[PDB]
Amino acid sequence: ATQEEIIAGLAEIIEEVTGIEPSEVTPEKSFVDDLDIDSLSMVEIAVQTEDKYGVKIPDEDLAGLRTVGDVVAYIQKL
Amino acid sequence: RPFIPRMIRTFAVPIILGWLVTIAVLNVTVPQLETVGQIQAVSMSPDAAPSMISMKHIGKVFEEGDSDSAAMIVLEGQRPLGDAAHAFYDQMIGRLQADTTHVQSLQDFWGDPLTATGAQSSDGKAAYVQVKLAGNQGESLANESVEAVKTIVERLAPPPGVKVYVTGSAALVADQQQAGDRSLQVIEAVTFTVIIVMLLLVYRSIITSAIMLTMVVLGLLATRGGVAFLGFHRIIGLSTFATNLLVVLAIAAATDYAIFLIGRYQEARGLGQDRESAYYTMFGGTAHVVLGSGLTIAGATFCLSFTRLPYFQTLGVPLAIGMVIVVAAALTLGPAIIAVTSRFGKLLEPKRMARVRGWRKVGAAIVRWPGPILVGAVALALVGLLTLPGYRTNYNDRNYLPADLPANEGYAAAERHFSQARMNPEVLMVESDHDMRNSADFLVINKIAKAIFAVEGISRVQAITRPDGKPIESFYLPPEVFDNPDFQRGLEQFLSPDGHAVRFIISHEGDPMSQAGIARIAKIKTAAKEAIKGTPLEGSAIYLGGTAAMFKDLSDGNTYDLMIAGISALCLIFIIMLITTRSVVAAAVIVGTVVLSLGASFGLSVLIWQHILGIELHWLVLAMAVIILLAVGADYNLLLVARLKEEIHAGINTGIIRAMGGSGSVVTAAGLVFAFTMMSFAVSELTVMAQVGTTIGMGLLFDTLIVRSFMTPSIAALLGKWFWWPQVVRQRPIPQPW
């Protein structure tokens, strides 16, 4: 489904940016709490999505997204 | 693309044997590079400037040698010198005059009582004599003459309580070359251990750095042999600065080319590529970049414009040829030695854990906030520019050498008693083209000396009026006492046998090579022109030989050759970017970033050097450092933009972070190696080379941490279509499915 595809894309970006395998990446966990992801890493994820695919997450909005669920929902909305 | 590597690697063993045999034949029959530079040097005074014309005409008319080299000798002791010292000095003078192939003429002053006051110090504990050697200052003949004078001095037994050293500008450059040659080996060793210690950290092996040591020393020997061959047959010329900078920059550039090569090799190994594929990907990736950057470092140096001094023309021609030899050595021997040596297991190993993530995270602060970071980087550059209002330069070389050298120690001894700029005189001439041996001409000749005196910092002039140099007034001499042997003893050292060209020996106040001391040259020329105006000397050519005018005429070319290099090197960068990449405006941005960061580099190097350490920047530290900074910053930014182009397929903004992640570790390692190798000049006995190296190293640190890191990619992000416009720009790749 679309959800699986978007989650797989995000997990591939996760593997590229900070080298954690997509296998254990699930939408039932946060970024900083578990994966030790800095605000800059999330910014890199946003830029990668914007470039490779057609999506835009404006500034002063990534902070409001804490869990993978929030990010995937926001992407699906647009 | 798979052809030149297929000729370099398949024939790796025969070409390595060829390199070894050519190095052997260039080192056994053709002398070593040090002796070749000693036998083949270039003038330190101009060849197409008024200063050199002055000395040439002076030699033509005075029959005192057709060159400008002038050395000095100091006899200092614990008490005033007695008659024993005078006898020893007379014997030494006779021995010096006996030699003819080395010394062209003797400007003896201490021997003659009438002018002995002009040699002995105020306290009477020192004296000096001026000799005129063969060949131009800093040339092979001048160095040979300096060595001959030193050997003659050491052959004789000094009287008890007095020691002898050799001073003067020609002796200063000779001892500068001696120090350069002596410290070449220690710089080689220190750089070799620095590369070892950094490879132990970036590659996790010691043999991996032993092979790099072998490669770097082989390349250094190859370039040494090539330059030795080309300078042994009188084809080109060399100098002390040319030789030392060639050697150390060759070591730094060879080790940086190796860093790029085996770092892309390390990246290939991390990506799973084998040896034979890592070799070809390394070539296709960085061999063209190395070629472009070597051609830049060669073309910019060679195109240091046709300047008054060989210290630019023949500092850029042999440097360009040496850099061509070094880039050829890279492109041929490096791949071959790699293919033959890194074919054994457990010799290379990658360390990629903690360096690929901190260069990809900093890359995210360039594309999501391109504005704030770009303006911040430009603000840092402008803050560096903020000290331009208080920028200073110093043309002196005594302050840029250790005190343990014979020349600098003689300067210290002279300064202990003399409080002047005595060891660096200045000569002015006026060709009246008629006999200047009448009373009226002598009365009016002192006008030029007095007019020169009016300028600040020329408080004493050793003119024809009196060697003492005390400015009393315009002397007048009766015609009856005009012609006597005693007066002729000095009149042959002041005016031509018939009288064509005058000489005005001049001693400055304080540092003669300072900004004021060199701005004094224009004032001297204007005063001379005004003095000859309205007098029978009108229409004469005011040629100003010496050292202060030598530096003035040479520094007049600073703007000229800087602009011409900033045209030619940037045009070559244009060509390289259009060939191995596709853009025209970005070929201008890649050099605009560097020229903007030049202000920050200058600010950092003047805060570190002048504000803290209290030492200003030598004029050679301006031109050479700026041009090498342009070339090497262009190398780094060119590697960055080449990687960006290789990663444009996935997007522009994402290409920036991809290139940063993929290139940051290697570029940082190379920049640290280059910076520390250049900073190794701090123990080079050449503090001017230390300033050049430290300035270049700090500029490269600022480039590898700020400019290349954020400033260039921020601009690339802000202007997307205007950065690859000729090749057509789609900022995002055509939208792809998930």
Numbering used by the authors:
A (entry chain I): 3 to 80
B (entry chain D): 21 to 493, 688 to 952
Manuscript text:
Clinical bedaquiline resistance is primarily caused by mutations in the transcriptional repressor Rv0678 which result in upregulation of the adjacent MmpS5L5 operon. MmpS5 and MmpL5 form a complex that functions as a multidrug efflux pump which confers resistance to bedaquiline and other hydrophobic drugs, as well as exporting the iron-scavenging siderophores mycobactin and carboxymycobactin. MmpS5’s operonic partner, MmpL5, is a 12-TM Hydrophobe-Amphiphile-Efflux 2 (HAE-2) subfamily RND transporter that is evolutionarily divergent from the well-characterized gram-negative HAE-1 efflux pumps. MmpS5 is a small (~15 kDa) single helix transmembrane (TM) protein containing a C-terminal immunoglobulin-like (Ig-like) domain.
To determine the architecture of the MmpS5L5 complex, we purified Mycobacterium tuberculosis (Mtb) MmpS5 and MmpL5 ∆494-688 overexpressed in Mycobacterium smegmatis (Msm) by affinity purification using a C-terminal GFP-FLAG tag on MmpL5 followed by size exclusion chromatography. Cryo-EM single particle analysis revealed both monomeric MmpL5 and a subset of trimeric MmpS5L5 particles. To address preferred orientation, data were collected at 0°, 20°, and 40° tilts, yielding 3.2 Å maps of both monomeric MmpL5 and trimeric MmpS5L5. MmpL5 possesses two periplasmic α+β sandwich fold “porter” domains (PD1 and PD2, respectively), with one present on top of each 6-TM bundle. Our cryo-EM structure resolved the core TM and periplasmic domains but lacked MmpL5’s unique 196 amino acid insertion within periplasmic domain 2 (PD2), which is predicted to form an extended antiparallel coiled-coil with a disulfide bond at the tip. AcpM interacts with MmpL5’s basic cytoplasmic Iα2 helix and MmpL5’s unstructured C-terminus (residues 946 to 952), which forms an extended interface with AcpM (Right). Crucially, the monomeric MmpL5 structure derived from the same cryo-EM data lacks this kinked TM2 helix and the putative substrate density. This suggests that trimerization induces a specific conformational change that opens this entry cavity, potentially facilitating substrate access from the inner membrane leaflet.
